[PDB]
Design a protein around this ligand. Structure first.
Ligand SMILES: [Fe+3]
Ligand SMILES: [Fe+3]
Ligand SMILES: [Fe+3]
Ligand SMILES: [Fe+3]
Lengths: 270, 269, 276, 259
């Protein structure tokens, strides 16, 4: 995997992503931003069910839960330029399907090599000729060691003609990052989580999985309190399904209410 | 010539799914009782008059029509044909668009087309693409070639190149009386007809369904809470208020905090 | 005998007796004017239009809507052609007037918390007519249909019978002289533009009072509403009587029998493409 | 081949003879045409239904457009090319088609007895295709095959290579014997708008019937434009006395028009 950032352009980042299926952007979040995210997130990780430590933890509905995710992450300029470059001419519009914080503690087993877009057999059966669907931004909230199980990737596996082949493990490259760095990959790229050999270290990450406008998001954000939705930018509101999408094909719009803009239809400002 | 292959009054739902597989279009006779057609027209007329050219379009039916809320969204034949059309790998489905269409005197003939062309990534797969759009076209009025009944090209959902829309001479007219329905795929070539009649307006009710993973055209979250609470859980899932359960991701999709969405926002278990 | 009220008119009452009660009292109640089905579709046709007007700093205790002929088919056909309304119009304007048309057709909604209205005469808007008080000519004829129940608790309209005959219209009376008009169904109250009246306060925390008013004019008084924007397809669906009511046909006063509201001294509706 | 004002009306009739297609309106007039025509096209609720209308056509222009009624039907270039195209033996002509429009074929295929004669057949259709919007190969320029009007066999429609794209900014004239086809509109935002005027010789039945035009619209037009829409009798050189008469008298005068 290419650990390329700092002087790298977003067009370049899109190019490494399309050639390899995975890219590492160094120092994406400021260390203060990482500390702000962990501070806002810790109480809700502790409250997940209101001598048996819980090794594995998964949490979503981040916009309701974190202000910095509400504002900083959903409006991040690099994530949006990479989304526009990844979806390209034919797609047009996109939104976030899943935003989740992931925690593996000590003793977590090794994961199977897999492709996330396997959840869509109708898309997954086209293998590498298939349209771009899933785009995954995997952000740091703890150190990524091979020892604590940093996620592994097989570069170029997004282009294979047969997706029944998940490859073999010696083809996987571990993604080592330290601070609020990110790794981007497509839903067609083979990957797997690592085993956490240390007895003393918990792996924490934030994944943001985006979809094209025409693929159903995994998360429903309509129970998000109205006051917090009104505090968000219209771009972030479209990302969480509160605004209509604008595909280039049928530019009149999609996800409408009475053939009119959706967010205005249920009380948001125009 | 090909003809449309009419059905119903003794055909099983499996037969309708099979006719849909082979021809891409089928006519279900006597689908709605005359009383149901009269409720539907009575409930829809005031909303059509306030919509502000004889052509008309209207959606957001569940807020506007009780018969659509209860009778149509819970219709057993529609759901049997839906489960037969999407089949094993899909599992769950929901409604993308429910609309009343009105085409009165002077209406121009439509160009031959395929509705699934609004999805270029799917449309470019031509006949080998997955099932996506399933359209139920109910006749709230008589469908005559004189008033512009929809024409179809059977077997065109099968074609290897969807850049070919076929020719107007391969088209078969769909004559429907009232409460009769025509079911078709989003991959089948079709077009609405010209309404020469100086006097008569054609009324149809379209119900366009999607597999679980394709975004519905309509958003129903501004639907009033007590009309949603009056609906059956199946009908609530059709309008996006309940989580889907694809065979692919059996644990669920369209969730709130990895929990059932309708329960999460105050609906009954 | 010890007590007096607005007089009711039942189905066995003729329109001549209704016109009689109307210019002895200035107000009359026509029981069971609209069938429950007519009230139901009238409310049904009006609901989407009101919802589009009022869906969006201010609580809404009050709603109004006009331009009914474009908006409601039952109003276009059933109400605008209603035989009793035309009998009473002919009797109210009488020989010297001859022809009449509708000045204002409006739906009014008074919900909870609406304050009591001041006593008034609707014809104060015409000072040259209003200054003649009870000697003045008939001008406004108001038909107020109850689209919901009219209770004193939700503010049923109050009237002062005989106030249309008063010699000084600067005097609007006092609330102790007003009698409430209780109506249930699509029952109607007819009153003159010279009779003092006022809407009540809606004390209820739950109930909305809804009414449909049709205010008619003699041919020579300018209607409040202009109906030029009514679509031609809906005007062509109307009967010639209803077309004259909304100003698309010439009037035929008894005074100037040749006609009024003409185009090149010819019938107006034919002159702009309607059927002869 | 393109033709400016240094081009003769003669020399354009001589392209039409040689190639079968020619490329030659005030931008203001173009906007006036678009302004008068837009409300009628919109009226074809505002029917979209997530299903926008892609192909559109409209006719009966004289009832609908004043500038088409006066300037276009009386335009000196259309009539000079019409007289030059029909020539001596024909004499008189009228409009068969006035339409706004937004496979290889030949319009004179609708006349099998004429179409069977191939390139030696008499002139019938003359088609003026004006650009109400930009005419690019990117939004689907009508393609033409020059010289196809003279081919000895009209069941050969040629192949899609011989097609030369007709690029216009804001008309192209062609015969009903020229192979042509409209292009595909790839542009994912723009729509090409054209106005076609298809003329016939006097003896060929026009496609459009113009009697439902209200009488005042007919009476405001020049006598030439009234003859173009079938309200005046034709005067063939063959039958110099007249054709399309009422009781052997001029038709438009017989039904209340001018002398
Ligand atoms: Fe994964
Ligand atoms: Fe269609
Ligand atoms: Fe008043
Ligand atoms: Fe052509």
């Amino acid at each position: 995997i290419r650990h390329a950032n700092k002087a790298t352009s977003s067009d370049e980042i899109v190019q490494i992503l399309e050639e390899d299926g995975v890219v590492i952007v160094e120092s994406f979040l400021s260390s203060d931003l990482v500390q702000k995210l962990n501070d806002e997130l810790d109480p809700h990780l502790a409250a997940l069910y209101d001598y048996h430590p819980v090794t594995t933890k998964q949490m979503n509905d981040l916009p309701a839960r974190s202000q910095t995710f509400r504002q900083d992450l959903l409006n991040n300029t690099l994530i949006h330029k990479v989304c526009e470059g990844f979806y390209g001419p034919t797609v047009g519009d996109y939104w976030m399907s899943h935003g989740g914080v992931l925690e593996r503690g000590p003793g977590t087993p090794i994961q199977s090599l897999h492709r996330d877009e396997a959840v869509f057999p109708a898309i997954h059966s086209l293998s590498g000729s298939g349209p771009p669907v899933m785009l995954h931004f995997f952000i740091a909230l703890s150190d990524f060691t091979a020892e604590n199980g940093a996620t592994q990737f097989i570069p170029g596996s997004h282009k294979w003609a047969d997706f029944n082949d998940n490859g073999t493990r010696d083809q996987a490259v571990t993604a080592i990052l330290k601070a609020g760095e990110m790794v981007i990959f497509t839903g067609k790229t083979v990957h797997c989580g690592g085993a956490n050999s240390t007895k003393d270290s918990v792996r924490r990450a934030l994944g943001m999985n985006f979809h094209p406008w025409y693929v159903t998001p995994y998360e429903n954000f309509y129970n998000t309190p109205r006051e917090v939705v009104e505090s968000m930018t219209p771009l972030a509101q479209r990302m969480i399904g509160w605004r209509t999408l604008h595909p280039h094909s049928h530019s009149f719009g999609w996800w409408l209410i009475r053939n009119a803009e959706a967010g205005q239809a249920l009380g948001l400002k125009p």
